[PDB]
Amino acid sequence: MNTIAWLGRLVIERIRGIGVAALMLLQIIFSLPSAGGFGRFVYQMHRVGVMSLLIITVSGLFIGLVLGLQGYSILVNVGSESMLGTMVSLTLLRELAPVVAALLFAGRAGSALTAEIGSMKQSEQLASMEMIGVDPLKQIVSPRLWAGIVSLPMLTVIFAAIGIVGGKLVGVDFLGVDEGSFWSGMQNNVQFGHDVVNGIIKSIVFALLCTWIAVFQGYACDPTPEGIATAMTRTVVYSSLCVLGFDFVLTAVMFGG
C-alpha cells in the first residue's frame, strides 16, 4: 500500500483555497469556535441537509444503479469468480461513492455558501455589521464551521448506503437473484455490517475542508456583482480536488481495507 500517502500529497501540493483567509480561521480556533442551534445553523443545515434529502433519495439511487449495471456486466462476463457482491460493494462503499458524495458538498453546497456570504457582505449582514463592530468571525463563520461536521459526514455514508439499498431492488430485475442471498452473500464477502458502521470518520475532515475553502471565497470577495460572480467560479477551482486527502488512510483503518 504505497498509495496511502500519495493521495494525501495531491491535496497538499496546492492550497490557495484556504491560505488567504487561513489567519482568520486560526483566529476562530484561537477565540474558540461557536456551537448551538442558531439561525445560521438552520440555513446551513438547509443547504447541507434539506436540499440533499431529495437529491440523495432520487439521484443517489440511480447513481448506485449505474454502478450496479457495472456489477451486472461482470456477472454476464465473468460470473462465478466474482459472484453477487464480491466486486460490487467492495469498491462502492470504500472507493467510488465517497468522491461523488463530495461533489454534492464541496461542489453544490459550497457554491451556495459562497453565494450567501458574498451577498451579505454587499447587503443583509456584514455590509453594516463589520462597520458597527459585531465581530464578523463570531457572527457568521464560527458556528457554521461547527455545523459542517454535524450532519454532512453522516450523509456521505447514507449516500453510499442507498447504493446497497438499490442493489437489492434490481437484483431480480437485471436477472432473478434472490435479494436475501445477494445481500447476505455480499455481507460475508466484504464484512459489511461491521465495516460500514465503523466507517463514519472518513469524511469528517472533508467537512472541515469544504467549509475552509468555501467560506473564503464568500468572505473576502469584492461585494460588487462582477467580483461576486468571479469568486463563485473560483470556488469550484479549489474545493473540487482538495477534499480527498484521507481516502486510504481511514479506508484501511475504519472500512478495514
Binding site: 434539506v50 434529502l53 453522516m154 455514508v157 448506503a161 460500514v196
Partner: protein
C-alpha cells in the same frame, strides 16, 4: 434544524452492528494468544484464517522465527468468547476430571499424601479452563482449491486445559506435497 429522515437513516445503520459486531470485533477482549511451532509452510500470511473442525474460530495474530533451529513461531488469535466449559459445565468437569484421576493406576498405588493432590489438580484446572483442553492436534490444510493455507485444530483427548501463554505441539506443519513428489 434537521429533518426526520436523519435520524431514521442513522437508526438503520445502528441496526447493522447489533449482532454483527458482537461476533466479529475489537481484538483482545474475545481472544487468547497461544503459540505453536511450524517447520515449512507453503502459503501462510499474518491474519490468515484459523479453524476448528471445519469452522473458523479466528486468525493468525503475527508470525515470528526461532533463530536456534531457524523454524517458525506463530502466534494465534483463537476464539476466546467461547468459554467452552463455563461455570455451569465446570461442575461436571470437577467430577469428570476427578474420576479420571481417581481410578487411574498411578494414583490408586500412590502415597495418600499424593492422593490428596488430585483435588489440587482440580484447582489448577479451575483457573485455566476457559477455551481448549490439553491434547490438541495442529495441521496445515487449504482454504480454497489452488493454494492459500488454512490452519486447523483437531481436538484430542487430554487431562489439563490450555490458555493464553501455552504451547501446542506440532502434528503436521512440514510436508509440502510438491516436495513429497519431487524428492
Amino acid at each position: 434544524a434537521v429533518g426526520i429522515f436523519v435520524i431514521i437513516f442513522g437508526i438503520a445503520l445502528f441496526f447493522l452492528a447489533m449482532k454483527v459486531s458482537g461476533l466479529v470485533g475489537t481484538n483482545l477482549s474475545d481472544g487468547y494468544t497461544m503459540k505453536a511451532q511450524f517447520d515449512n509452510v507453503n502459503g501462510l500470511k499474518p491474519r490468515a484464517k484459523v479453524t476448528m473442525s471445519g469452522v473458523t474460530i479466528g486468525r493468525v495474530d503475527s508470525i515470528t522465527l526461532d533463530p536456534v533451529t531457524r523454524l517458525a513461531t506463530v502466534t494465534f488469535d483463537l476464539d476466546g468468547k467461547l468459554t467452552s466449559f463455563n461455570a455451569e459445565q465446570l461442575k461436571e468437569v470437577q467430577k469428570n476430571a476427578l474420576d479420571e484421576l481417581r481410578y487411574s493406576s498411578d494414583y490408586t498405588q500412590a502415597t495418600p499424601a499424593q492422593q490428596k493432590t488430585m483435588e489440587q489438580q482440580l484447582i489448577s484446572n479451575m483457573n485455566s479452563i476457559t477455551s481448549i483442553d490439553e491434547d490438541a492436534y495442529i495441521m496445515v490444510a487449504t482454504n480454497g482449491l489452488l493454494g492459500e493455507k488454512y490452519l486447523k485444530i483437531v481436538p484430542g483427548g487430554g487431562l489439563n486445559y490450555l490458555k493464553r501463554g501455552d504451547t501446542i505441539s506440532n502434528t503436521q506443519g512440514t510436508m509440502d506435497l510438491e516436495d513429497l513428489i519431487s524428492k
